[PDB]
Amino acid sequence: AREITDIKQFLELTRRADVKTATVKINKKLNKAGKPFRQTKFKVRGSSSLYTLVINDAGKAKKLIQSLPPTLKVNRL
Amino acid sequence: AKRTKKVGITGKYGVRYGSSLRRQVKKLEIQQHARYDCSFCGKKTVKRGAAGIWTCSCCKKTVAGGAYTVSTAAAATVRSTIRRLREMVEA
């Protein structure tokens, strides 16, 4: 329910010691009339709120999923 | 244009209640709805809120007065008498 725009804050937020699960949503969006790109959403289920991080870059998305802690349950959908 | 000859504000009562009664009701409502000078702010902004309550739109002052006018003649006579008694008793 709360959006996060800082990657450092997000990666820190993945180590809050209360979060157990997260999900990664892939969307197909259009930047303008010609070019469709792939939207990726990072949602971390906090104890009290849901934090969503949105990335419009595929490369950054790959680097970030690579950088998630292994102890966190990730869902692909 | 001039809409009525004599009824004026009491045209809303139509042909009923009798001529004379409508006459003095007009005579009083004209005073009731009129605008009065602010004794404090000096403007034509004093209106009647309720019976006897006269307040000024600007300067936010309210003065207790007559039910149908800002002040009656008896009030003026009383105020003058009080002033006479004050300047008689202090000197």
């Binding site: - | 004794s39 404090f40 000096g42 403007k43």
Partner: protein, 96 residues
């Protein structure tokens, strides 16, 4: 009366109209005399005497309200206070 002296001030000298203008002038020390209408808010009156006393300025109280003072200076609106910056050709500063 005194209104003729005021009129000659207006036609000859310089002056200000209004509370903000007069307090600004009195703050700068350019005011020689101030005139207060009868029904001026007494708190405003009192701060005016305090300012004048701080500025060593003569004070006169108009025997009339805002409307009478405004007509005295020859204006179609009401004036609560006037400040005299220069007499020009008048005599109010010497008398009263």
């Amino acid at each position: 009366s005194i209104n003729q002296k005021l009129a000659l001030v207006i036609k000859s000298g310089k002056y200000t109209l209004g509370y903000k203008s007069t307090v600004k002038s009195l703050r700068q020390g350019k005011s020689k005399l101030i005139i207060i209408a009868a029904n001026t808010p007494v708190l405003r009156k009192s701060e005016l005497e305090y300012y004048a006393m701080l500025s060593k300025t003569k004070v006169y109280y108009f025997q009339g309200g805002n409307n009478e003072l405004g007509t005295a200076v020859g204006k179609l609106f009401r004036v609560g206070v006037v400040s005299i910056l220069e007499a020009g050709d008048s005599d109010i500063l010497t008398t009263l």
